[PDB]
């Protein structure tokens, strides 16, 4: 078949490395190039086709939709890069002096046996009155032309049985790299909302390690046009309540997800399937380009999401509907 994914050798790391990024923005302010999350699972979506000239215009359309868990990303550092004949080089790096336990644990494999005496000499130095620390920022600003921001997932919010986080370097495209570094510093230890990185109808793309069929699979993959249908928030009740049906419920299937915890945090719905599987980290990017076409220009018209249980068959969408139709039982009044 295709020799571009051969040899059939397992990837080096579960986390999918991001290679390319957009170039620059001359006028717009600092913006995040990409976002990351975890694959919650897959469900079904039904809407009305507003795509112009469609044979099924204004007719119902059903397609599988993946749910990605995207807890608020938090910034913990900034990395400066300088152009060289050998390519980009990270000449300097800096932290925020308040690394969360989720990040400190990633620096160990025996955290239980570890003395946990990390980020002390630098943190104590960082605790000084700036003077020493500002030298690195000034050096980065003087020479660096591309700046990357270190981020990690708030695994504590997710239901995964994992405390260690992962560090991902995210690039920025805003001009006047001095503005970029100033913005990065002002956001140290702060979180960025999901809605502030991506919006509805965006033709973003995602990359993740596919499921291992076992050495088939388990490799890094990419696919463009992973359109986001609707971004949801865990605190904003009625996320599963679509625009049309507006049924009071949540996207979490009855009885939770198959071999995965219940979704109770920020999440995004993406058209079609996505690489990887449940309990796997994924990354999101804007495809590095703009897919100018009427397919992108259309708008979402979500009508209903399949939230039935996946254990056995399913006759109900929410517990409120089951009790009314099924009535009482032995285990009830």
């Amino acid at each position: 078949g295709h020799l571009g994914f051969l040899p059939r050798k397992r990837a080096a790391s579960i986390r999918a490395r991001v290679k390319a990024f957009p170039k620059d923005d001359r006028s717009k302010p600092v913006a995040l190039t990409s976002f990351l999350g975890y694959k919650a699972g897959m469900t079904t979506i039904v809407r009305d086709l507003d795509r112009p000239g469609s044979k099924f215009h204004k007719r119902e359309v059903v397609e599988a939709v993946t749910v990605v868990d995207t807890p608020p990303v938090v910034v913990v550092g900034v990395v400066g890069y300088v152009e060289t004949p050998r390519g980009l080089r990270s000449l300097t790096t800096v932290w925020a002096e308040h690394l969360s336990d989720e990040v400190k644990r990633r620096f160990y494999k025996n955290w239980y046996k570890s003395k946990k005496k990390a980020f002390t000499k630098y943190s104590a130095k960082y605790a000084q009155d700036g003077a020493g620390i500002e030298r690195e920022l000034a050096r980065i600003k003087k020479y660096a032309s591309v700046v990357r921001v270190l981020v990690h997932t708030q695994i504590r919010k997710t239901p995964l049985a994992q405390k260690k986080a992962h560090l991902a370097e995210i690039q920025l495209n805003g001009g006047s790299i001095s503005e970029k570094v100033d913005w990065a510093r002002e956001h140290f230890e702060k979180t960025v909302a999901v809605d502030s990185v991506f919006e509805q109808n965006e033709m973003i793309d995602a990359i993740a390690v596919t499921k291992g069929h076992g050495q088939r699979g388990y490799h890094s993959r990419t696919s463009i046009n992973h359109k986001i249908y609707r971004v949801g928030k865990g605190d904003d009740e009625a996320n599963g309540a679509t625009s049309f049906d507006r049924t009071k419920k949540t996207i979490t299937p009855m009885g939770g997800f198959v071999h995965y915890g219940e979704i109770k945090n920020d999440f995004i719905m993406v058209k079609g399937c996505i690489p990887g599987n449940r309990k796997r980290i994924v990354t999101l990017r804007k495809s590095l380009y703009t897919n100018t076409s009427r397919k992108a220009l259309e708008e979402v018209s979500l009508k209903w999401i399949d939230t039935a249980s996946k254990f056995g068959k399913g006759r109900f969408q929410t517990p409120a509907e089951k009790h009314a139709f099924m009535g009482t039982l032995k285990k009830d009044l």
Binding site: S243, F244, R246, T247, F316, Q317, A320, E321, F325
Partner: peptide
């Protein structure tokens, strides 16, 4: 119009 068209099953 945003028709509910579905409520409580």
């Amino acid at each position: 119009d945003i028709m509910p068209e579905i409520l409580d099953g």
